[PDB]
Amino acid sequence: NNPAIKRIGNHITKSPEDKREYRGLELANGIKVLLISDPTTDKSSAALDVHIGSLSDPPNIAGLSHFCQHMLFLGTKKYPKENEYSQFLSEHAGSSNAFTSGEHTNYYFDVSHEHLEGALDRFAQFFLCPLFDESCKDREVNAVDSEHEKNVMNDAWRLFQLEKATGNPKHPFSKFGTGNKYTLETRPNQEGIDVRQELLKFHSAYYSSNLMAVCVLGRESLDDLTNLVVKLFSEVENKNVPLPEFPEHPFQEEHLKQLYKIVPIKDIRNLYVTFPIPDLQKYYKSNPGHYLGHLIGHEGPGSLLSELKSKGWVNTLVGGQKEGARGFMFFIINVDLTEEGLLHVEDIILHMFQYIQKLRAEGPQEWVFQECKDLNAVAFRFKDKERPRGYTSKIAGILHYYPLEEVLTAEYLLEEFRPDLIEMVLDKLRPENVRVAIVSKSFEGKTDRTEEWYGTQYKQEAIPDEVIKKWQNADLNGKFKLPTKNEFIPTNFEILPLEKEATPYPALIKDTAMSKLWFKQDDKFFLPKACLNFEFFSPFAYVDPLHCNMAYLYLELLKDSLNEYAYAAELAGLSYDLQNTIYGMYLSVKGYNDKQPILLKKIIEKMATFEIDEKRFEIIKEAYMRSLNNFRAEQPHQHAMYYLRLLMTEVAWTKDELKEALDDVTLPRLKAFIPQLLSRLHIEALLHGNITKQAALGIMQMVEDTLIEHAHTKPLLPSQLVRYREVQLPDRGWFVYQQRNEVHNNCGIEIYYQTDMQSTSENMFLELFCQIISEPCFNTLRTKEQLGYIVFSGPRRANGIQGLRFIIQSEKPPHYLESRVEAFLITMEKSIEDMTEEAFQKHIQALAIRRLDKPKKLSAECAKYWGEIISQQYNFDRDNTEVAYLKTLTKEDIIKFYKEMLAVDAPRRHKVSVHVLAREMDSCPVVGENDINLSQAPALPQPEVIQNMTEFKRGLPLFPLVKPHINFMA
């Protein structure tokens, strides 16, 4: 019947827990579509994935594909406004993003469910009639350049491009995909290329319906969704473009048995081992590559990491298959190196080949395959409901690899055991097909090459035949054994019935001097999972720099100790997070509830009776020191945020103070610290999930009793439960703190306009104002003025206080950046004065939907509750309360708020700026003094420059703490 539809797939296989409706189909023009109906979703979503990416970039214009991606958002013939798309999403509680990989360009958005069509319509035009406006092209070229600039000093990106540069230079795999001003503007200009036309050509050439996949999720019925999608996408032209292919591997003969010595930016020590392998994608029903990754990358008893770590050569390891593109893949085994490890690379690699030999000797094991198959089946059946935005994006991408009916199960459900495929891949992991790369500062000055796109310094040597020979003769090592049955595999999935006394929010069911227990039995997701969150309060975790280092070292030593045993629980879907905080310790255990008690008990017991291995202590301490120093390699904007934090918090140890005190922590010192840290404590926890009240009280008491029995822990005094305060800036004050980033050649800045203490009133004024300026901020500071790639605005919340912050990373100096933000602020004042009452009411509605958007899974709902507990505000009904209040604000209230707290002449303006200067910038003024279509920046007062943080805080008062919310019950 319907000529617009080539076919409607059969029933889409889903989990019996998934209440969403599904319908797959293929349009006449060849677009693969997956429709999703969720009548309860608050936000609708859509995504389109074109099966063409940077790998198809024309040789003479590197990055064109990524630039085409950016440009599609800047206007279409049907919707000309450069920001019609983003503005429409913003006003309807939506958002959007897009990415470019070697073979894909994925576009997606989410929006209030009531505006799916308006959003989908504007979105569809991207693939029908983009304008590629000449003025937008000239401006947007800077965003792309800015994007590359932040990556230039990033070790991961440098290594990513270096591998590409080190393969066959004729293979498209060697292309630079990001692109920058040089490749997108300069170069083409000095070669008479009209990028506008090149974008038009590329778009007209590859954006063919036959290479597109779409996924839409909304409240509408499947029939309504179908007509909707047929109506907006059946008009995309099918140009029958052949799907790009790359059968010849980028690493050929001359590229194997090669060794690379690389100089990193951060002080890191890594060893990368790569093997070229065939494309294994078509074998998704068996996944031979993952089978070997599961074994080679295994942690736990008898594993490769175990021996490497015992020999004190390695700390972490990653093994498995790495994607390439249609036609080729790689198999990697990457390890980090200890100092000793750096000097034993040859032995480390032999151990790898010894372990691989064991795999060949034992042969493929079906029980291992069965185990993963069972685990994956359980994971699929009980998979958490995804957020619409990420879900549609993911489906659109994988619709290109699997039949419509299997698009949900293909990546989870295993079906075939393939000892033949497994052996075939194992036969590619041999010394004569290996590539080895070492990353270490020790290579500084010894390199003879440079990677052109990032400037990476390295040396390339052939591996001597004898070394290859020694590896080829690897024999069985008695230390290497295959894993044993995974005893953490869950088997009990019953959902306890909802107790009669069940509450909508966490209830306080234990309030003792030793512990405060918040509890809630899951009443909406119904999966066999639970979240056990614990907060251990102790003044000694952050009393001084030395103890902060010990709190950290201790927990890091503990996790390194439990790793081998915890890995099994990990594969079985039971993980935990343990870290030190400025108030003590944080422990989180989540996953299938079945075996959580066992993992938890083990952690606490281990914690309270810990024995530190001296060798592990020196190694982890050396890494921690390196980690503290490496902060200098972080980006300018991250430095700005770090500084503001140190500046506004009553107590905070800098990274310089931490490493200085690090030489003082000795094994003896750490051993004394632990028992002292555990002697006096207070525990506040939230147990949320598939568990009863008595199981919860039981778990809480088991934790206390373990600590009491092994560490003689006693309660902490209530007045000892202290929370840090935020510095109170003076009315009409403006302070500036300036610093320099010595790695990145970009400037960073954070502007913080402190308002007042948090409260229903203060909160909504600030949030409404942020909702109204959000998209305009991006459109003004980035799209129009192109200050940088990183342009951010939003509320800042800390220690119960709040305010508006702006964060920008750019080539332009901080004082200039400041001027533009002040100019923008004026533009927003006028703008708000000029907007209609309905437009105002529209933003209120948008904010409301964002705040009332319901969590789709247990961990997300838990997180919201945990946030109320940690902040000690315990306002569980905050969203309904704050929204009800938000719907009462008038345009006048926001104008008053701005004129009183934000305007340059506001009586209560509390401003602080953090200026981070670029590497190649000696000095720079703190304040500075035409009309190139740029708004007029107001004149600024003279700022008081901060020389010493400690003095700065001493001469200022401290805000009080926010009062709790009354949540009564025994």
Partner: peptide, 11 residues
């Protein structure tokens, strides 16, 4: 562990 780069439009 077992193995499991794109550029974006937006920070």
């Amino acid at each position: 562990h077992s193995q499991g780069f794109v550029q974006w439009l937006m920070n």
